Design a protein around this ligand. Sequence first.
Ligand code: FZX
Ligand code: ZN
Ligand code: ZN
Ligand code: ZN
Length: 231
Amino acid sequence: EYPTVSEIPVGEVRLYQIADGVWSHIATQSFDGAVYPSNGLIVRDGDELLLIDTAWGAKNTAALLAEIEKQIGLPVTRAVSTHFHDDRVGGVDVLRAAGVATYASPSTRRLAEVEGNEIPTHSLEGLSSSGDAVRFGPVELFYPGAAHSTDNLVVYVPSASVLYGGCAIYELSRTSAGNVADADLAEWPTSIERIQQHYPEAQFVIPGHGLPGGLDLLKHTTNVVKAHTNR
Ligand SMILES: O=C(O)c1nccn1Cc1ccccc1
Ligand SMILES: [Zn+2]
Ligand SMILES: [Zn+2]
Ligand SMILES: [Zn+2]
């Protein structure tokens, strides 16, 4: 069973092995009154680990980098932030202090700075226009276009057919739409289509938040997006 938010004390962080050499990480943070869980990804790269998105904040991220050492016992070497919000770049400072080389599209770095969020050090070139793609070690890095944010990226592990959608995909539990404060509601369904086309073989689908599912997580999200459009 996958961790639910009611069993993760704040500042704590669990793992969950999807596949041989592919894990998710699961944290919590509280935001004006409530509790929300956040997913990242950990991909084995030979004898190194590649981390996808922070555990949402310095403290959580410090913790996540301790659990990896105890449980998997390999070094996290490179890190990618799938978008500029604090559940993704939150902890970039910590990671870099810890020997991790940190990455993000130039598009994401620019919005993070404007927002004031922490800014990954390196710049990922070649995903400025949809539906762009570049390879980064054990994964491919995909720009489907504007959706939950204008810069959002998505990740695929071919080795294990795991696709990580980030906050541009919701879990089925999520029926109403979230902070679409930075969203491009206009293009969000279009941009999901690009995803569906680029990875039809994907067996596990992991959203930014909550319970994994299959590729039917995409149609779920498109439905909730359009509902909100006409609100
Ligand atoms: O929607 C998101 O991606 C998001 N990131 C941070 C907070 N949210 C809202 C959210 C998060 C979890 C459950 C419901 C709503
Ligand atoms: Zn976001
Ligand atoms: Zn989010
Ligand atoms: Zn649905």
